Design an enzyme around this catalytic site. Structure first.
Site, PDB file in Angstrom:
ATOM      1  N   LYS A  68       0.897 -16.141   3.109  1.00 44.60           N
ATOM      2  CA  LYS A  68       1.857 -15.444   2.256  1.00 44.60           C
ATOM      3  C   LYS A  68       2.922 -14.656   3.005  1.00 44.60           C
ATOM      4  O   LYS A  68       4.111 -14.934   2.888  1.00 44.60           O
ATOM      5  CB  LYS A  68       1.119 -14.506   1.310  1.00 44.60           C
ATOM      6  CG  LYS A  68       1.895 -14.147   0.067  1.00 44.60           C
ATOM      7  CD  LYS A  68       1.173 -13.056  -0.692  1.00 44.60           C
ATOM      8  CE  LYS A  68      -0.242 -13.463  -1.050  1.00 44.60           C
ATOM      9  NZ  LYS A  68      -0.965 -12.289  -1.590  1.00 44.60           N
ATOM     10  N   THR A  70       3.593 -14.612   6.167  1.00 42.82           N
ATOM     11  CA  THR A  70       4.292 -15.460   7.109  1.00 42.82           C
ATOM     12  C   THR A  70       5.522 -15.990   6.405  1.00 42.82           C
ATOM     13  O   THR A  70       6.633 -15.853   6.914  1.00 42.82           O
ATOM     14  CB  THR A  70       3.398 -16.609   7.606  1.00 42.82           C
ATOM     15  OG1 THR A  70       2.264 -16.053   8.288  1.00 42.82           O
ATOM     16  CG2 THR A  70       4.160 -17.501   8.591  1.00 42.82           C
ATOM     17  N   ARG A  91       3.549  -4.126   3.041  1.00 44.59           N
ATOM     18  CA  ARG A  91       2.555  -3.042   3.154  1.00 44.59           C
ATOM     19  C   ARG A  91       1.971  -2.745   4.549  1.00 44.59           C
ATOM     20  O   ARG A  91       1.858  -3.665   5.376  1.00 44.59           O
ATOM     21  CB  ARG A  91       1.378  -3.376   2.243  1.00 44.59           C
ATOM     22  CG  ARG A  91       1.746  -3.689   0.816  1.00 44.59           C
ATOM     23  CD  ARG A  91       0.705  -4.573   0.175  1.00 44.59           C
ATOM     24  NE  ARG A  91       0.898  -5.957   0.576  1.00 44.59           N
ATOM     25  CZ  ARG A  91       0.063  -6.953   0.297  1.00 44.59           C
ATOM     26  NH1 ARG A  91      -1.059  -6.726  -0.389  1.00 44.59           N
ATOM     27  NH2 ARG A  91       0.377  -8.190   0.672  1.00 44.59           N
ATOM     28  N   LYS A 102     -11.089  -7.791  13.602  1.00 48.33           N
ATOM     29  CA  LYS A 102      -9.829  -7.948  14.333  1.00 48.33           C
ATOM     30  C   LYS A 102      -8.575  -7.872  13.487  1.00 48.33           C
ATOM     31  O   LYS A 102      -8.515  -8.430  12.387  1.00 48.33           O
ATOM     32  CB  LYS A 102      -9.824  -9.268  15.112  1.00 48.33           C
ATOM     33  CG  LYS A 102     -10.798  -9.290  16.265  1.00 48.33           C
ATOM     34  CD  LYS A 102     -10.672 -10.569  17.043  1.00 48.33           C
ATOM     35  CE  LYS A 102     -11.522 -10.517  18.289  1.00 48.33           C
ATOM     36  NZ  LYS A 102     -11.389 -11.784  19.059  1.00 48.33           N
ATOM     37  N   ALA A 270      -5.637  -4.911  -4.414  1.00 49.52           N
ATOM     38  CA  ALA A 270      -4.968  -5.694  -5.461  1.00 49.52           C
ATOM     39  C   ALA A 270      -5.910  -6.167  -6.586  1.00 49.52           C
ATOM     40  O   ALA A 270      -5.679  -7.218  -7.218  1.00 49.52           O
ATOM     41  CB  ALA A 270      -4.222  -6.903  -4.845  1.00 49.52           C
ATOM     42  N   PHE A 298      -3.244 -10.950  -3.174  1.00 47.23           N
ATOM     43  CA  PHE A 298      -4.001 -11.962  -3.932  1.00 47.23           C
ATOM     44  C   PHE A 298      -3.134 -13.078  -4.518  1.00 47.23           C
ATOM     45  O   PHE A 298      -1.906 -13.031  -4.419  1.00 47.23           O
ATOM     46  CB  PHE A 298      -4.822 -11.310  -5.064  1.00 47.23           C
ATOM     47  CG  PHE A 298      -6.011 -10.515  -4.579  1.00 47.23           C
ATOM     48  CD1 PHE A 298      -6.612 -10.809  -3.353  1.00 47.23           C
ATOM     49  CD2 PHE A 298      -6.538  -9.473  -5.356  1.00 47.23           C
ATOM     50  CE1 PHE A 298      -7.722 -10.075  -2.894  1.00 47.23           C
ATOM     51  CE2 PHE A 298      -7.657  -8.721  -4.914  1.00 47.23           C
ATOM     52  CZ  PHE A 298      -8.249  -9.027  -3.672  1.00 47.23           C
ATOM     53  N   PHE A 378       1.279 -27.577   7.995  1.00 45.34           N
ATOM     54  CA  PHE A 378       0.082 -27.618   8.831  1.00 45.34           C
ATOM     55  C   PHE A 378      -0.079 -28.978   9.503  1.00 45.34           C
ATOM     56  O   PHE A 378       0.033 -30.019   8.845  1.00 45.34           O
ATOM     57  CB  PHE A 378      -1.139 -27.341   7.979  1.00 45.34           C
ATOM     58  CG  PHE A 378      -2.317 -26.943   8.766  1.00 45.34           C
ATOM     59  CD1 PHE A 378      -2.452 -25.629   9.206  1.00 45.34           C
ATOM     60  CD2 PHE A 378      -3.290 -27.881   9.098  1.00 45.34           C
ATOM     61  CE1 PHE A 378      -3.548 -25.245   9.968  1.00 45.34           C
ATOM     62  CE2 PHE A 378      -4.394 -27.515   9.860  1.00 45.34           C
ATOM     63  CZ  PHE A 378      -4.526 -26.188  10.299  1.00 45.34           C
ATOM     64  N   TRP A 404       6.267 -20.606  10.338  1.00 44.59           N
ATOM     65  CA  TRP A 404       5.258 -20.136  11.267  1.00 44.59           C
ATOM     66  C   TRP A 404       5.612 -20.537  12.690  1.00 44.59           C
ATOM     67  O   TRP A 404       5.548 -19.718  13.622  1.00 44.59           O
ATOM     68  CB  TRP A 404       3.890 -20.725  10.919  1.00 44.59           C
ATOM     69  CG  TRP A 404       2.825 -20.280  11.879  1.00 44.59           C
ATOM     70  CD1 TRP A 404       2.329 -19.012  12.021  1.00 44.59           C
ATOM     71  CD2 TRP A 404       2.182 -21.077  12.880  1.00 44.59           C
ATOM     72  NE1 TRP A 404       1.424 -18.970  13.052  1.00 44.59           N
ATOM     73  CE2 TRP A 404       1.308 -20.223  13.596  1.00 44.59           C
ATOM     74  CE3 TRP A 404       2.255 -22.430  13.242  1.00 44.59           C
ATOM     75  CZ2 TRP A 404       0.513 -20.679  14.661  1.00 44.59           C
ATOM     76  CZ3 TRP A 404       1.466 -22.884  14.298  1.00 44.59           C
ATOM     77  CH2 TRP A 404       0.603 -22.009  14.993  1.00 44.59           C
TER      78      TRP A 404
END
Lengths: 549, 548, 548
Positions: A68, A70, A91, A102, A270, A298, A378, A404
């Protein structure tokens, strides 16, 4: 080439604030790459026209991934490259996530807002104020009991829990005030992860300080041995709390890898909250920009929903478009395909998964805003698959994003569609429901028009609770569903587009610093815990650099 | 109102310039506050240090100390004579601000600024600490939940959690309740953040890498076999450190008189040395001819500790050292009530004086000069003054009216510290040895400084000491955790109490520094707001604060 | 006042004689109560048993059950015709006595005596239990403190403590607080004693040696690996048993009509079969021609359970079985309010009747006779009676006015039970099999008896069941832990609720018998006194009790 391994050239935010129209006297710097912009910037601009508001959302999120932020950032950078004047509002993430599993980046690849390390850590001390503005009130309560309890609060009714910004289980259920008549009144409470504090929620919905303040004085802390509500207002605490958030009220300015300016403010749960960044960061973003990309937590059955029904409703915003993100793999996942065999082609599992995206499309339409799907690219996705996904979108403009990898460039197409639709299809925005409707009515509209649920079932607690609030005067407030986000139904296992099912709300909470929060499943995970392998265990900081974050 | 005293500040970035700091060595937090990098020191590692006007004070009393004011007001005078000197103070816990109001950094026209940014969030140095502690706690509790691989006893856990607010209700609690997914139920509590061993480590560390390791040694608890377990065995060392990468840097602000002031750290003076951070001064030194630093509580606690904790590890040698004190303050030490300070009395002022005189002596014992500093008050008439004046018959004695006169009222004394630091060359030495015995180290600290004819150790104080030494945590310094209102543990014995004795009831180990030998109930590691809190009364105008 | 009804008792030792008990087989607890040994049964092991007038009742209501009275009053009539029969009841929890007062054993001129000795300490049968439970708990908690050799998870511990008083404040607590010498902190609570799995084991055991082992199988909790741990692995079996050597013996008392009455045991009828102890009846049998026994709650719970728990293990075959019921009681089942029982209504009395009719049917299903028993009340006029009278068109239907007439008002019915037990020879069979499935056993108990079109099991009820069967505790009976005020789990559905369904939320294992499948919140395992307790009002004169 890992996301953080991509540390490169940022411009001083003053240069940025400057090259945007912000006066030097309205910039409270933090390093040369961070800033808290005065609310005066907005205040003096209120009369000009607003920019175009583009809300980015996504499909039912599954473990396979979508991407999202990205996109949110890539979409931005792209709009910029096409000459358009634009900002992005995102945010500040919670801290604990860094030491347990991480920390990640504001998006990723070449699509992200920086300085990364700061935003991922203490950033500009926003959360800390929330944490304290919160724990202070918590102490004013415990103190008031300790002081003779004039207001007559039956301690066992206290809802105002205590909070901290780390993932710690044990703090979920603890007993307080022990030791003798000189240590307070014995009681039951716990700690919630900071980001989930109603205080943060308020910061994300307030107009400014005096507003944010009144809200505080509305927060319910518990009830009298009589039933009547007792708020922080009765403990006269809004000024103090207010004073703690005095510096947290201003948005924070920082850029993309490509320099595009962006606001990182707020950032709440959310399910228990609207999962949106503050209205002030955005509203200020709408005058300083001709285009404004922002995103919501979400899938679109939640973030999007609340973005439309809570944020925009309060802020008077009027979304012009709305991009929705979906990957092929997550889709196939929604079509039944396991996690392991995902790389393998399967237009069939992909076709039935589409029902998912195809539902969000439809929903986003239930608001009057034009939708544009973005297929986060992808390596394994085949043409035989993407090509299908595209025509399958027989409804809204489709386009693959390679943001990306290629940063702004790979996001050029989408911008051209968003832009394209930002001209030929003007948005006719409007809340899904009305505030002067029954509470169970509001809930059905959502469960019925968005979750595609047949109806709603409620428990005895759920009823008394609701019944209380309505007569206690909070029935006409906005509703905020707290369900599992991995499904359109309160059943996290029911992927894809679940039909002939019923939502079961079994508890109903309240956030007078906003509205009614009804949880369905154990969507009460208000304080996550660390894994057997605390990400913080492989953490270390070099005599210079930081390694393993 | 001392708050109204908000007028005329300057760009810190500039000050950083007018001190010799490369622009690339200052992280601004607004235009009037700025984190300075550790790179400064390191390079000026060899450059000539400076003097060390270590300011301290008498014995606190309900009359009025004056420790800090006097300390900065002297710097407002010192450099006010064309001199290269700074300051090195501490950020005041947050919690007090919404409980018993707040005050300026020092006092009068010698208060470091801006005021508000201090009592409040400032450069959020505490928060950093706060988290670097709680997390550790979080990892400890998590471990247990995992399977307690280190075979730790939840009941032996000494590592409590931390918040920076005056919360009573949080001093004794039970966490982990709820079942296999909520972890392991056990008893702990919360102590104020400034009172954290962590804030301490901060105040006593060379650099992050030092601090990092200085973290790993801190014991969280033991196992069922009694084997100590440290943050080290837990792997939270570096982790904690990264939460601190920003606080490890000293802050930078000025005086009303723009005198370069470092305000970094803020440890509990009783349970800990109560002095500001090292790095701040060790670095402040290089960057100056002189450095004016103060410590917590009286000179028997803060001064002694500054001499045996800080200087020890960091290698300082307190060229000078001043001692504040007021009339009315030393009067009380003569039996003078609080509602009886208004009047004069040259006899009570006399006896009480013994306090000031006792301290003096102790000072000299560390092989470092001393000088009397007197607070000026509207009622400390002529007769009263000329008495204390001459009574200090032992070493330099100058009056200071910095309060209502700014760096001015400090001139007199100013000259004095230069004068008596120019002709009086000291050879700094620790008042005791790190190789003695925990039992004997308390011995010489009790004897010579407080004045203990002897020291007694209860059944507990004994068992622990032994365990500590049987483990190895015995070769460490000693932080006397006793009531500050008298050399004696008796909070009622004013003056220069004699024939007494100090009894040690408990003994807590701080493997992030030294050993805290608690005396009376000096365990106020978590205060508590009043029935009439400043919080209930604080409000922020549609513009600015009102009542803080 | 039914209490005033204290007049004319007899030596139990004599009664023990007039029954065939060697004097050496009675432990007197005063002259009017006496523990009888197990030696009696054992020897008369082969002697011909007797009949079993198992008395039960309709569906409880705020109108007035009548279960017990009717039960003894029938014995006051049965033997009142020269017959060899006794009784077998249960001691009523203590706690209720100082909370919501106390009542006589049954009612009217059919109450076993002395009254007071019952509601109170009696032969201290509970206390025995109470300790045999707490201790176990004490050994569990102690183990942990020792080193938890069995690697048990304190958080998985299912064995709570026990007191026989209505204490709310004790339903959720945390013990072990205080440190390495106070043991391991953990969460538990207290349940009333009568509600103890122990009291249960008591009510379902052949003899001490049986009971002893029947103890060892009861699971206290599990380990970190999920491996069950039993009192056995703890070694508390025999121990517990010795605390019980005296309660294992049935008590002995008479009626106002001196009819040999056994009053031994007292289990929770919902979480457990709610019937009296075995030994009492298995022994009472030999020593008599007949034996009149009752069970807890309605016939859908107590009766069913008596048939599948007791009879099952102990091998009984309930030759007969009666079913109490009153007018006003069955009226409510027609919508009749509590403040509306005073009046007549032959239509509501009708529908409501469905309750009585539903039970009837179920009875027959166990291969045992049935007969209607009607309570007599000042308002159950002629019109009302002649309706219910004929409505029971299905099996014997006799009215009983034992209340105000003693064994007299029971004569009518008396003859009936003899008559319909003489000509009606039953073949007792369990309504389900021990080899079916926990899931299917609930199935046939829900279907046929309550009337569940189906049964639903929540996410929890499922996981447990599986664990149980994956462990082995699956081949056990089933004690339906659901609200007693209706065949349905809905405490509001009076009459003969149809089309409904029973959902099982939870499922607790009792390896000291069977399986408790809890439905709604029927976990009232610890009641609580009112705001106006009989305790505040109880006083004992310089002579005798007043207000109990």
């Amino acid at each position: 080439d890992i996301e953080i391994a991509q540390a490169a050239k940022m411009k001083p935010v003053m240069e940025l604030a400057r090259g945007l129209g912000i006066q030097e006297d309205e910039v409270e710097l933090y390093g040369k790459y961070k800033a808290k912009i005065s609310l005066d910037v907005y205040r003096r601009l209120k009369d000009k026209p607003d920019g175009k508001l583009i809300l980015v959302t996504a499909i039912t999120p599954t473990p396979a991934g979508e991407g999202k932020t990205t996109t949110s950032v890539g979409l931005t950078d792209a709009l910029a490259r096409l000459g358009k004047r634009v900002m992005v509002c995102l945010r500040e993430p919670s801290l604990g996530p860094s030491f347990g599993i991480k920390g990640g980046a504001a998006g990723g690849g070449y699509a992200q807002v920086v300085p990364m390390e700061d935003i991922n850590l203490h950033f500009t001390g926003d959360i800390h104020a929330v944490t304290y503005a919160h724990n202070l009130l918590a102490a004013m309560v415990d103190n008031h009991l300790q002081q003779g309890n004039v207001l007559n609060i039956d301690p066992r009714t206290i809802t105002w829990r205590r909070v901290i910004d780390l993932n710690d289980r044990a703090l979920r259920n603890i007993v307080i005030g022990l030791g003798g008549k000189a240590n307070g009144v014995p009681r039951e409470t716990g700690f919630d992860i900071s980001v989930a504090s109603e205080v943060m929620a308020c910061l994300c919905l307030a107009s400014d300080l005096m507003d944010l303040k009144e809200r505080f004085s509305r927060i319910v802390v518990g009830y009298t041995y009589d039933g009547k509500p007792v708020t922080a207002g009765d403990l006269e605490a809004q000024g103090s709390m207010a004073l703690l958030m005095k510096d947290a009220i201003k948005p924070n300015l920082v850029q993309t890898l490509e320099n595009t300016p962006a606001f990182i403010h707020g950032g709440p749960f959310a399910n228990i909250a609207h999962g949106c960044n503050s209205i002030i960061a955005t509203k200020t973003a709408l005058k300083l920009a001709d285009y404004v990309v922002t995103e919501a937590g979400f899938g679109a059955d939640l973030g999007a929903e609340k973005f439309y029904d809570v944020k925009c409703r309060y802020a008077g915003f009027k979304p012009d478009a709305t991009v929705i993100v979906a990957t092929v793999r997550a889709l196939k996942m929604h079509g039944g395909v396991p996690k392991s065999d995902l790389a393998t082609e399967n237009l069939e599992a992909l076709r039935e998964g589409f029902a998912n995206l195809e539902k969000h499309i439809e929903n986003i339409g239930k608001f009057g805003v034009p939708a544009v799907v973005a297929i986060n690219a992808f390596p394994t996705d085949t043409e035989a698959e993407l090509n299908l996904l595209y025509e399958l979108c027989a409804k809204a403009g489709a386009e693959v994003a390679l943001s990306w990898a290629k940063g702004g460039e790979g996001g050029l197409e989408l911008a051209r569609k968003v832009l394209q639709t930002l001209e030929s299809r003007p948005s006719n925005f409007h809340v899904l429901y009305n505030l002067d409707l029954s509470i169970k009515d509001k809930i059905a509209k959502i469960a019925t028009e968005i979750y595609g649920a047949d109806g709603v079932n409620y428990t005895a607690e759920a009823d008394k609770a609701i019944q209380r609030y309505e007569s206690l005067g909070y029935g006409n407030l906005p509703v905020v569903m707290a369900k599992t986000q991995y499904s359109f139904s309160d059943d996290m296992t029911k992927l894809g587009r679940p039909r002939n099912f019923t939502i079961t709300v079994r508890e109903v909470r309240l956030s007078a610093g906003g509205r009614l929060i009804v949880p369905i499943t154990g969507a009460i995970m208000t304080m996550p815990g660390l894994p057997k392998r605390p990400a913080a265990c492989n953490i270390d900081i070099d005599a210079d650099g930081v390694i393993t974050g």
